[PDB]
Amino acid sequence: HMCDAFVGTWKLVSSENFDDYMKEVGVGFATRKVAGMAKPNMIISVNGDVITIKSESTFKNTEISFILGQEFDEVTADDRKVKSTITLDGGVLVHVQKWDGKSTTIKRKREDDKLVVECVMKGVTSTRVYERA
Numbered sequence: 001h002m003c004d005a006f007v008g009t010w011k012l013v014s015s016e017n018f019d020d021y022m023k024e025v026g027v028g029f030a031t032r033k034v035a036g037m038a039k040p041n042m043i044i045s046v047n048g049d050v051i052t053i054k055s056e057s058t059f060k061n062t063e064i065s066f067i068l069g070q071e072f073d074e075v076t077a078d079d080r081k082v083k084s085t086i087t088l089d090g091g092v093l094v095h096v097q098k099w100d101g102k103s104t105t106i107k108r109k110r111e112d113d114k115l116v117v118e119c120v121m122k123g124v125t126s127t128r129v130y131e132r133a
């Protein structure tokens with residue numbers, strides 16, 4: 001029952017400062033423009049200890065499956081090859097991606113009927129809000 005409140009199908013309803021977050025990450029112009037337009041569907045499911053997060057969009061579809069605390073390989077929407085670890089900290093999913101000596105942290109939290117995603121790359125935060133689809 002660890003992620004019960006995250007499970008489901010979610011749709012992006014708002015975004016703030018995502019272009020700047022992507023600039024800090026190192027995303028190029030064209031990918032920032034097209035990725036920034038996307039209105040992804042996030043589908044979160046749990047089967048035993050394995051959590052799956054799928055993102056479906058017009059630009060790219062992504063999928064990760066993982067066990068909490070156990071590092072894995074991820075290919076991001078912008079085609080970075082990263083080493084990721086996802087943990088639960090006080091009811092917040094905390095996702096750290098490492099690549100090329102860089103790091104970004106993505107936090108996912110339930111707040112009211114929303115799933116709030118906070119993405120941080122050095123000093124820059126983007127906040128992305130999802131509602132149930």
Ligand SMILES: Cc1nc(-c2ccccc2)nc(Sc2ccc(F)cc2)c1C(=O)O
Pocket residue numbers: 022025027035036038040055056057058059060061062076077078106117119128
């Ligand atoms: C945390 C995050 N990072 C990035 C992301 C995207 C590009 C470069 C770096 C990071 N995208 C998304 S959602 C998304 C999925 C597919 C897509 F084609 C566009 C957006 C999210 C999200 O969870 O809201």
